[PDB]
Design an enzyme around this catalytic site. Structure first.
Site, mmCIF file in Angstrom:
data_model
loop_
_atom_site.group_PDB
_atom_site.id
_atom_site.type_symbol
_atom_site.label_atom_id
_atom_site.label_comp_id
_atom_site.label_asym_id
_atom_site.label_seq_id
_atom_site.Cartn_x
_atom_site.Cartn_y
_atom_site.Cartn_z
ATOM 1 N N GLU A 108 15.223 96.470 -1.922
ATOM 2 C CA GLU A 108 15.575 98.208 -2.182
ATOM 3 C C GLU A 108 14.575 99.089 -2.200
ATOM 4 O O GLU A 108 13.603 98.356 -2.981
ATOM 5 C CB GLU A 108 16.056 98.290 -3.749
ATOM 6 C CG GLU A 108 16.505 99.453 -3.640
ATOM 7 C CD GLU A 108 16.801 99.795 -5.103
ATOM 8 O OE1 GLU A 108 16.252 99.037 -6.138
ATOM 9 O OE2 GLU A 108 17.442 101.329 -5.445
ATOM 10 N N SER A 166 24.841 105.075 -8.572
ATOM 11 C CA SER A 166 24.238 103.663 -7.744
ATOM 12 C C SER A 166 24.525 102.445 -8.165
ATOM 13 O O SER A 166 25.025 101.852 -6.923
ATOM 14 C CB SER A 166 22.521 103.942 -7.569
ATOM 15 O OG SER A 166 21.887 103.479 -7.151
ATOM 16 N N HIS A 195 24.564 105.184 -1.308
ATOM 17 C CA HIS A 195 25.358 107.078 -1.878
ATOM 18 C C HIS A 195 23.954 107.868 -1.087
ATOM 19 O O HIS A 195 23.152 107.221 -1.358
ATOM 20 C CB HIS A 195 26.176 106.818 -2.554
ATOM 21 C CG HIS A 195 25.229 107.612 -3.831
ATOM 22 N ND1 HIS A 195 23.847 107.095 -4.575
ATOM 23 C CD2 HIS A 195 25.536 108.626 -5.034
ATOM 24 C CE1 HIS A 195 23.426 106.865 -5.294
ATOM 25 N NE2 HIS A 195 24.257 108.282 -5.865
ATOM 26 N N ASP A 218 18.114 103.557 -1.757
ATOM 27 C CA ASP A 218 18.335 104.893 -2.669
ATOM 28 C C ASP A 218 18.418 106.102 -1.616
ATOM 29 O O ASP A 218 17.317 106.980 -1.568
ATOM 30 C CB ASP A 218 16.915 105.356 -3.567
ATOM 31 C CG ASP A 218 17.385 103.920 -3.797
ATOM 32 O OD1 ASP A 218 16.639 104.048 -5.176
ATOM 33 O OD2 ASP A 218 18.330 102.861 -3.770
#
Lengths: 432, 434
Positions: free
Chosen positions: B322, B102, B364, B51
């Site tokens: 993640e 996201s 991002h 993230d």
């Protein structure tokens, strides 16, 4: 090994698959891009401050989000490199370089302190890739839209303890060990004239009006010294165009502006809450640009034509200079993209040319949401997509893109250091 | 034989103050890269998402945890690298929105369609499109979905849920904010309900809280979503010991590990950045979070257990991992360290197995920047004491393209400039899905 046009979005960006930049598997294309054969020539293009953020912002504005820079985005082999400098006293990393220390790193293969040109933290000189090229019999070119005394072009030809040492005056004050009258090699401009590259093109005529303090050309202006030493001096597009050769008997020195050459685009400076409080901006052409002042791309093409006559090969560096002005910054990336296209067009035809495109370090600009209320300076821009993009400047050290095409381009893939770029160029040209 | 090469050591090779000492290469890479390229099928794919982990975040974390000339043995070790674009769309006009959230970015790589900010698994017309995980399952592959965020958060949710707003975690939020998706209003259900329907073989993360909600319609009306999972044959685990005991995970006994009520514990603690913090407050040394402990599995441990369970499937597996985020520098750096450890696990497996494509990227980028120590900045700043014994300053004052890296079959498809939606098509094609 030519091509990989194009990687624009392939269709309707709102539809499944319409924003893809690829049309199929790339294993064959990438394999075909890999060669371990000698590079006859190298063209290194540097965009001042051109990190990934600046590339994206300029693409979004000039080409649209799904658009494609036919030069910058077309290089098949890509990686990220680190550009930290050193603290001069401790030798520990300094996480945020200036342009001088970073140019020294790729130009000499040695890390140094911020402000140093062509010297290490002990102030000891180390040879540059351009000096080495010339010593091997290769033609050499040094092109910039900055003043030629600025850090990036200077780093190829000058070894001084501070980047401020443009000419005799500043050198005597700020780099006394390098001052000609004190037994040193001289100011940046004097060392430039000693280095005698075959082609040197850029701004910075101002410093050539200074007079030398010592040596054979004492009392003459540095321009007079250049004339006395057999340089072909040109100052505009017509005089440049008429040059038919450049070599050691008749080296070319083009001085196209007093300071920096003209910026491509104009717009207002970013302001506090400028995206909220001021209208969206459409960049405008700079009236000072005209067909009597060669552009970065035109200087690149002319350097290629003159240097390519050397049968052994050439080394050419091209810098797209940067002068919180989004339009100025984006137009500088567009200038660099045109120069990269010329380089790639040549390299694809010639077949033995390594082209490398990267930056000294990244600018601090960020692309932010349109409604952003940010603490620094902001501006809204009307892009080629007919949408608003907001850029924020919020008083950098990030790793940033390096990309290449041609023999030995594999050496920019993955994580590397900016000093590896010296050794990549060294090895590709077979220099010792 | 573990044989396509991983980059073993791209640390600075010597004394960084000496000529050549800061080189990360020891010689020409043409042969190595030629040996890195294959378009044979990928049997397995492991996609790891950090993230906010753009190039700036990677560099800051490397600087802090490894030194400027250090090397992340996972993140920095993938031999094939490029940059990808992650712009979203304006819902009403269909024009680019240059700064994604996201949810839109996860939708792009999981379905290959651009969408509006906040959308999960639907396009700008609110139409559902299948995800890479759903497609893998339909082809007989095993599937894993691992996160240190709540499992309802956008990145894990985008693999299993199609909803018009990422806020639609459970029945209550869905009926309010995504009425067309609410089960009792005729839709497919909340994120959590769709997760239970999707029935990945292995799902591990945070977000137990939403499972206490009761369903509003259907076969399990009035039961909590936990009770529903239990009734539908899931193996539920809640800590490291219970995770460790699991011997198999499959469609008869799918594994659902819920290791925290919300997000799982961050790795490192430190103070929030503050106005003129680099000037007005001392340089910070990050500290261990005591909420981290051997009863709560780490991202790397969940990755290793998922690989162990999924690799039993003869046809292959798809696994997404993640490393979640959350102006706290220590928190964000520690999150990158967490991800690096999970990438090491994935690469160790992939190197030995030989038919596994490993991809490491971000949704991002975060807004943090590395700036000069003396900086007087208008936003939030902090000075940090790094592994080098020097101060690094971070500033929080985004749309930038960012690194994507890969190892294994079809890794060439991340090199150069790509779009985040190309990653969907890369994964599809590599696994031979239709």
């Amino acid at each position: 090994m030519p091509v990989l046009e194009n990687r624009a979005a392939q269709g309707d960006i709102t539809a499944p698959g319409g924003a893809r930049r690829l049309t199929g598997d790339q294993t064959a294309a990438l394999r075909d891009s890999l060669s371990d054969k000698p590079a006859k020539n190298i063209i290194l293009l540097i965009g001042d401050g051109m990190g990934d953020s600046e590339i994206t912002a300029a693409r979004n504005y000039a080409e649209g989000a799904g658009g494609f820079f036919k030069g910058i985005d077309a290089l098949p082999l890509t990686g990220q490199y680190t550009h930290y400098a050193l603290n001069k006293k401790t030798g520990k990393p300094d996480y945020v370089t200036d342009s001088a220390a970073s140019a020294t790193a790729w130009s000499t293969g040695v890390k140094t302190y911020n402000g140093a040109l062509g010297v290490d933290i002990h102030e000891k000189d180390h040879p540059t890739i351009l000096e080495m090229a010339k010593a091997a019999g290769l033609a050499t070119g040094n092109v910039s839209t900055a003043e030629l005394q600025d850090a990036v072009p200077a780093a190829l030809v000058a070894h001084v303890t501070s980047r401020k040492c443009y000419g005799p005056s500043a050198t005597s004050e700020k780099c006394p060990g390098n001052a000609l009258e004190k037994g040193g090699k001289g100011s940046i401009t004097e060392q430039l004239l000693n280095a005698r590259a075959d082609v040197t093109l850029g701004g910075g005529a101002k410093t050539f009006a200074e007079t030398a303090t010592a040596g054979e050309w004492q009392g003459k202006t540095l321009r007079e010294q250049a004339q006395a030493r057999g340089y072909q001096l040109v100052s505009d597009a017509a005089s440049l165009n008429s040059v038919t050769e450049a070599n050691q008997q008749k080296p070319l020195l083009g001085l196209f502006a007093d300071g920096n050459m003209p910026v491509r685009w104009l717009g207002p400076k970013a302001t506090y809450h400028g995206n909220i409080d001021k209208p969206a901006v459409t960049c405008t052409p700079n009236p000072q640009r005209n067909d009597s002042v060669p552009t970065l791309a035109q200087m690149t093409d002319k350097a290629i034509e003159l240097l390519s006559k050397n049968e052994k090969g050439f080394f050419l560096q091209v810098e797209g200079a940067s002068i919180a002005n989004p339009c100025g910054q984006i137009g500088e990336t567009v200038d660099l993209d045109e120069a990269v296209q010329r380089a790639l067009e040549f390299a694809k035809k010639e077949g033995n040319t390594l082209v490398i495109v990267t930056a000294d370090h990244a600018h601090a600009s960020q692309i932010v949401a349109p409604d952003t209320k940010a603490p620094g300076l902001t501006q809204a821009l009307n892009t080629k997509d007919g949408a608003v993009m907001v850029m924020s400047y919020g008083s950098t050290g990030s790793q940033l893109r390096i990309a290449a095409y041609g023999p030995h381009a594999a050496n920019v893939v993955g994580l590397t250091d900016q000093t590896d770029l010296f050794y990549t160029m060294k090895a590709a040209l077979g220099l010792k």
